[PDB]
Structure 1
């Protein structure tokens, strides 16, 4: 079952007007949604209307969908409503800078998938649920949470007056639900490493073709990872604060493992905070930097994401050195 938004919630969203000061700021990659909480659902409406159109979705149905997605996001330290809008904004920025490379159906599907990619996240990783035999792990063997996030997306759409894709043709509706499915599954970090390695091989050899559906799905998959990790592409104080939020969620998972007598990995151990800057260095070198490097190679206008990630790596390197 899903939590439904109140009549006052979507009615207020329909009446929302985005300030002219922000419409110029929202187009840039390094944009931080953080200081505009009350404007987050309205920011998404504006983003949808600028990427797709003012009549792509019925304004009533769209406002109902957004506010109901918000209510189904848990009050965890990182994988919350704030994360969803940050991921959706990064997708908007990528789509805006490479608009014609993607179809109308893909732009609509990817912005919706981004807002729904971590729906009903309980604050626990896939390895935790699989190790401690959580009901979700029995229902989904691999990409546990990601398979659950897609199921919750379908459920929100199945609600009365929430089906934003009902006006699409049967074949297009089937296509948008498959774009969303593959995009949400791609946010499982375990799948990223193999996906980036294949794309690097396809790019280097010059065999990468955007007309090829298998290559298209791989590119979209990398875009999903790049959006999911975009907190590493913000200004250093924003990046620094977001790191505290994800570690509060990692440490809480470790605290749960400790209650069962199992010692977590240093990254999930709050008694091992000193190892966080070195752990961050490893994450940028092996995960973040290669992601944005490959993304820049395939989609050159995404270059500012790699630059901002490199700037934050240099900042973590200054922490280790003592500077």
Structure 2
């Protein structure tokens, strides 16, 4: 049965390298719904937060429908992958018993919504084309503000309020944390976020049990922001057969954007010109300047928990580099 194979694959939800594309096919293009449901059951979140199962499924299906099935990368498979990757990172030994159930819920929910309704073009493209989204959001974290607004507005649809049984203080705290986490996925914030994560590593405090000591909102939210940003930038850290599929998809999405820019007489964005592209050099640069600086720092924060992930990233960088000469 197709459902038996799906269930088998979902037994890997605690593992880096889950067969997320296979789950997308086996679930009938519902990877985000089935992975979120499995994660909520694995973490006992429905019981903890009194979430009716039918409300959870109804919301997840509606949220998943608001990802664009015609966008090659920023679709429901990406959202499911970022959810599952955040779920693995939350389980790292260095964070055991660090975060509350509400903080865990915020990080997972933020991951699920963090790209919803993405049109497959960048913030800079939306700004430069005078788009309605950029007009609404004053050119500032245009997509990320939109993803938050859609993700929260869908909670108001019929039988979609998965937070119906949280206290008012819980809903207020969860909303603020989710906003802070999704806004941190704007790449224009990456350098300052990484700089701050490095300062935390250099000053980090560990408890008598060996777990990170985070004793104020600023430190707790910074870790959760960088956790979801690492999940969002995790593709080059995955087994190569998954990483190559993510690269094929982001290139397709970029090339389609660059076709729009070329037609409009605009300068083509970096990496978006299918007639002057070096996919492999672009991956090596992405890893060297963005992905490895981030993941090496996260690995230092939770050291040695993420050593195998870092090792895979480094192997994948070597593999892409080897395809150049």
Structure 2 length-normalised TM: 0.88
* Structure 1 residue 25 displacement after superposition: 2.2
Alignment correspondent of 1:89: 84
- After the TM superposition, which residues 77-226 of structure 1 pair with which residues of structure 2 at under 5 Å, given as runs? 77-97=72-92, 98-141=95-138, 142-206=140-204, 210-226=214-230
Q: In the alignment, is the contact (CA less than 8 A) between 1:51 and 1:95 conserved in 2?
A: no
Residues 1:162 and 1:111: Cα distance change in structure 2 (over 3 Å): same
Structure 1 position 319, deviation (Å): 1.0
Greater alpha carbon shift after TM alignment, 241-250 vs 194-203: 194-203
TM-score after normalising by structure 1:
0.89
Q: Cα distance 1:269–1:303, how it changes in 2: closer, same or farther (>3 A)?
A: same
Of 73, 89, 110, the residue aligned with 2:67 is 73
* 2:265 counterpart residue number: 261
What is the aligned residue count? 305
Q: Distance in 1 between matches of 2:10 and 2:150?
A: 31
1:51: Cα distance to partner?
A: 2.2
Instruction: Give the structure with the larger helix fraction.
Output: 1
Q: Which string of whole-angstrom CA distances, capped at 9 and with x for unpartnered residues, describes residues 137-178 of structure 1?
A: 111121100000000011111112111112011111001111
The aligned counterpart of 1:6 is: none
5+ long unaligned stretches in structure 2: 206-211
CA RMSD of aligned residues (A): 1.9
1:58 maps to 2:52: yes
Structure 1 residue ranges without an equivalent (≥5): 1-15
Q: Note the alpha carbon deviations across 1:161-216, whole angstroms, 9 max, x for none.
A: 11111201111100111111111111111112111111212322447951121122
Rounded to whole Å, the distance in 2 between the matches of 1:17 and 1:99 is 32
Alignment of 1:308 with 2:312, yes or no, is yes
Specify the SS of the correspondent of 2:200: helix
Does the Cα contact within 8 Å between 1:18 and 1:42 map onto a contact in 2? Answer: no
